Design a binder for this molecule. Sequence first.
Ligand SMILES: CCCCCCCCCCCCCCCCCC(=O)OC[C@H](COP(=O)(O)OCCN)OC(=O)CCCCCCCCCCCCCCCCC
Ligand SMILES: CCCCCCCCCCCCCCCCCC(=O)OC[C@H](COP(=O)(O)OCCN)OC(=O)CCCCCCCCCCCCCCCCC
Ligand SMILES: CCCCCCCCCCCCCCCCCC(=O)OC[C@H](COP(=O)(O)OCCN)OC(=O)CCCCCCCCCCCCCCCCC
Ligand SMILES: CCCCCCCCCCCCCCCCCC(=O)OC[C@H](COP(=O)(O)OCCN)OC(=O)CCCCCCCCCCCCCCCCC
Ligand SMILES: CCCCCCCCCCCCCCCCCC(=O)OC[C@H](COP(=O)(O)OCCN)OC(=O)CCCCCCCCCCCCCCCCC
Lengths: 504, 592
Amino acid sequence: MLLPWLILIPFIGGFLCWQTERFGVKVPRWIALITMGLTLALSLQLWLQGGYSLTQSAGIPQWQSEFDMPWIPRFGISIHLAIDGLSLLMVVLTGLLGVLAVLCSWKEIEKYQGFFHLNLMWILGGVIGVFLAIDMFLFFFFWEMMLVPMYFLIALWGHKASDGKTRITAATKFFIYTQASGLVMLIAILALVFVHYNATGVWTFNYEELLNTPMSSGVEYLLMLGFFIAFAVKMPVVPLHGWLPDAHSQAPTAGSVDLAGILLKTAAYGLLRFSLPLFPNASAEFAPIAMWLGVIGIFYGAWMAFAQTDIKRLIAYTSVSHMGFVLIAIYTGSQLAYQGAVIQMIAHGLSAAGLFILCGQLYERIHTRDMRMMGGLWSKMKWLPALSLFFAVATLGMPGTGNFVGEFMILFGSFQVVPVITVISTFGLVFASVYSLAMLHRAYFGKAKSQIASQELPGMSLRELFMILLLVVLLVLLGFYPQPILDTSHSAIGNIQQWFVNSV
Amino acid sequence: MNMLALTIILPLIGFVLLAFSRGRWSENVSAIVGVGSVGLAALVTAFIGVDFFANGEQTYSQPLWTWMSVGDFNIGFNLVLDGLSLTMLSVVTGVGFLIHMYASWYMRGEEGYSRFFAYTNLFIASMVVLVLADNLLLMYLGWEGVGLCSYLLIGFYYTDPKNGAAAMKAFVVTRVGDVFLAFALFILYNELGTLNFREMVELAPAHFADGNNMLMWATLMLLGGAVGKSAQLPLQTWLADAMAGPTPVSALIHAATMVTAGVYLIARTHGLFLMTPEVLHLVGIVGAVTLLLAGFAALVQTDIKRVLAYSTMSQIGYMFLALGVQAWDAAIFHLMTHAFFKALLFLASGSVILACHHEQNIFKMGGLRKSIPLVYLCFLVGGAALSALPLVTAGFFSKDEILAGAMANGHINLMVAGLVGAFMTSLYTFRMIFIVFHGTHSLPLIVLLILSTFVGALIVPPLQGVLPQTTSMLTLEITSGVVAVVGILLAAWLWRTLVTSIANSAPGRLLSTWWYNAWGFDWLYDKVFVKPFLGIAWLLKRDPLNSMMNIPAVLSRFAGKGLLLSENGYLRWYVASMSIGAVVVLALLMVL
Ligand SMILES: CCCCCCCCCCCCCCCCCC(=O)OC[C@H](COP(=O)(O)OCCN)OC(=O)CCCCCCCCCCCCCCCCC
Ligand SMILES: CCCCCCCCCCCCCCCCCC(=O)OC[C@H](COP(=O)(O)OCCN)OC(=O)CCCCCCCCCCCCCCCCC
Ligand SMILES: CCCCCCCCCCCCCCCCCC(=O)OC[C@H](COP(=O)(O)OCCN)OC(=O)CCCCCCCCCCCCCCCCC
Ligand SMILES: CCCCCCCCCCCCCCCCCC(=O)OC[C@H](COP(=O)(O)OCCN)OC(=O)CCCCCCCCCCCCCCCCC
Ligand SMILES: CCCCCCCCCCCCCCCCCC(=O)OC[C@H](COP(=O)(O)OCCN)OC(=O)CCCCCCCCCCCCCCCCC
């Protein structure tokens, strides 16, 4: 009995963060750090007591933890939480990212900072909730309720140098994309529930009972397509990626909203836990389309990243390319590629968190994000260009970082399944090296292209530097020793893979 | 022994300490840390070799952990040592230590001293990992690290945009080669189920009994990776265009680590290459072709660094030819001797650059045989080892062993390619030294001056039991010495009216300009890869997919603006619209 508290602790922490605004302005950051550390420590405790390295795949459903309480008993809707290895890896990841987001939004001495913390913990608790829910209506509810806090802290707390109309436009674009796709998912969920009620007589929203739903191929294809469109908006999958670079660029300039909301992909988890087990035949027929969309995402995100003059838009397009790799991995049906996708999700979260935090620090140092306005920043800053070099090397796919482990394990499994897509994706890795070196040469190398790049910039604060170094250490540990992560996710990955391949 | 992990860890410790130093230490302290870490690696390598020869040269394995274990996918973090690994490790550590000593002398009063030594220490660490890995994925780790360190070292003077452009070009070309190598790794795991070198060699004949297409694909992609790192065809432009970095960087890349990685990859995977004889002969053809183009391009260059770069290209082509004609011992021996004399030549070139000012042209300067006798003598003996002066230099013996391998295997085209390559090598080498030098006793200079003579030929690589033994010799020695001597005499005779008469002729000027442009491979690669990349990037700088997905918002705005015209505020129109809707409802109900 810790998953209900795993979702409740961020909510109560954000509520009391808003409540303690009367006691000061420097107060709610400490409460925010306390509640995020509490959530992270509880997730680490459930990891340490879980014993995921010694459990075998015994057939879906198989959870480490489970909880059920009737919420809307008229519809058979209940708060139904559960956890296994992959879900626990995701919740530990968002706990760590939320701690980093709180530590990144430090020294934001301003009025209504408590509401900013309240929105941040609503987003983080919502991400934890969609990672933990196994009731379909409850999962969709958690899926759609990050939207109001994210919209409000993009439109009201966003990039202050830009016009307020631009932030409002980006927030409305993000809201419309994600909420329309969520409504499509709700239609698919309702149709699945009604189909199970007609074919059996039992009315429920439980995921474990909706798995054995006899239906025609076209109906299953349509349900899978609704789920896939909902996940493809948030993955992002081209051409539904367009909300992401403007949402990143109009995010608050601290670089905490990116970590809190975007930089963990609940869409890959949603595909793995719902698109493959509920609709395995439809996913099997849909696999070539998703794989070619992933290839297009890889190369289009690479070309988009090379063309930017903004660093933040460049990093957003790198995220698009990496998620194209993950989308190829998910539909292979290969255990090796599934584990590589899990490693790639975690490594992408860490590396993109480091890139966005460094970009935010650079923007606070030089008051611009235009790459034509700088150059030669290696001789002006003490820590930022070398850490940026490390993180560009990491998202380049370099061995010694976890991105290489995830990417190449994806490519090994995919080459066992689909060789041509794997070949094209490895040339996508060449494209990744091209855009990473282009960003490094434009930002930190050469001569100064303006007057702000010709001065000795201020150094790095110790808290920012230490959490960047923590991300560096975690990425290096993932690259050199990914075995605890694989042993954690192996049982859930094997159960999903076996349910996917034994149903086709 | 538990000392191979020491040879990895010590340069890693040096890199980490000097990177986190960030230049706050003194020059002496940073030099002590970097050069001491590389020298400690060399001393541990020497003790490893002593222990290796103390036993019966037995192969030793040192596992550390399991890198990844997903089902049947078991990649281990293990090191292995045999004669080939010992030879490559000794060459890398010793030549890197000498280059580190010369760089500590050479980088005095330069910004980024500790950054330079951190990058070179990570380079040494990456190549030690490359030569000691027992499986292909750990070797790929070392491969990628070596490429990244070469990128960081070529663009060391980052303020000059040409240096960064050269470094970026080298990194992109080598990354293409490593993508070919990744294809080889994927094929070999998908077929054999393992990436361990000994296990792949043991499992290949049993698995590839019916079909042999996938093994040929894997060996072709291994050759693609090898020519990616060793700067051969068709991935060769980076070595020519990336000498903008410092001279010890060039010495390290050309002698110690970077270009010898492909030769090591071919030699280590010889068991897989022997099952695909067509791919091995293709290695030989690639080496011979790169030999010819490098030799022809080296004569028409007007810079010392570019001439030395194409010399490195030609000698790596010799090693690739030796691997193609199954002269593995000759290939590794030529690797060691070429490391010695090319490191010596780059050290002497750096000394003559420091003696001159601003790195001037070679044509306007001359008569340096009196001002600087020591650099002239070092350059002369390095060229003699490069141009194979008989019975006085180790390069003559190494090229003689390569040509004997070409003799014994019955290959004619590769034989004549090697012979005219030796001739062309003699002409361009003695051309360059007689153009520059006609008309302080540093310890590394003396060390690789001694090692460029027959004293370096006395060293025998312990490849017995690791690489297969190579299968008229007097006549071959006589004709090789004759070819080298007539090349020396011809280059002494010309280089100055006949050379101007030949060069100023329109076919002669056309050929000189064609061979100065790396046989047009830079232009060809630009027009087929770099210009269309920039064209597609410019075509896709405004996100067309985002605009096409934003089209429904435009449609919604247009439809709303059109619908708002009916709310004109006229009561009579409201009554008219009510009656129109009544007509529509009544007609629809009567139709159905
Ligand atoms: C624009 C944004 C919103 C998206 C579009 C709106 C939703 C569109 C849904 C279209 C559905 C088309 C159905 C066509 C046949 C209808 C009549 C029929 O014969 O139905 C068959 C079946 C009922 O027969 P029965 O045997 O009782 O069912 C047991 C099923 N084995 O029927 C059933 O069992 C129910 C079938 C339900 C099918 C899934 C509905 C949702 C699918 C996801 C959303 C639509 C597709 C993705 C989005 C498109 C682009 C925006
Ligand atoms: C102002 C802007 C808004 C207005 C303008 C824009 C358009 C809005 C409307 C868009 C949606 C249109 C309707 C889409 C659903 C169509 C449903 C349909 O025709 O179903 C027929 C059939 C039903 O299944 P059936 O075979 O009858 O099953 C019983 C026996 N098997 O179905 C099948 O058998 C399966 C059919 C699958 C293909 C049809 C759905 C295509 C969806 C395209 C979008 C998604 C593409 C994939 C993802 C791309 C990347 C995200
Ligand atoms: C065919 C068989 C043999 C195959 C192997 C051999 C052929 C391939 C060799 C490719 C070599 C390409 C070398 C390009 C180096 C470019 C370095 C550079 O500095 O480029 C300039 C630019 C730098 O970016 P920036 O920092 O913004 O600088 C300011 C802009 N001037 O950067 C750029 O403009 C970016 C340039 C991107 C180049 C991408 C190269 C991709 C290579 C793919 C090879 C695929 C082979 C198979 C092809 C299909 C066959 C069916
Ligand atoms: C190619 C590299 C060669 C190796 C040297 C450097 C490696 C990278 C160093 C940074 C990352 C370290 C992460 C991995 C540490 C070891 C993980 C591990 O599994 O240790 C346990 C192992 C004993 O247990 P094991 O053999 O795994 O048993 C099987 C389990 N049933 O424990 C052992 O066997 C002991 C292993 C000791 C390793 C010491 C490494 C010291 C490194 C110092 C410099 C660090 C530089 C960091 C940055 C590198 C570049 C990114
Ligand atoms: C296994 C053997 C090798 C095999 C191949 C391995 C390849 C993968 C290696 C991955 C690591 C990244 C490689 C490239 C990093 C480059 C960093 C760099 O440029 O460091 C130099 C720089 C100091 O240079 P300087 O210019 O003097 O200072 C700038 C301020 N004026 O330094 C600084 O400014 C400070 C340091 C910046 C970050 C240094 C690198 C961090 C990542 C590696 C160490 C991680 C932590 C060690 C422990 C790991 C866990 C055990």
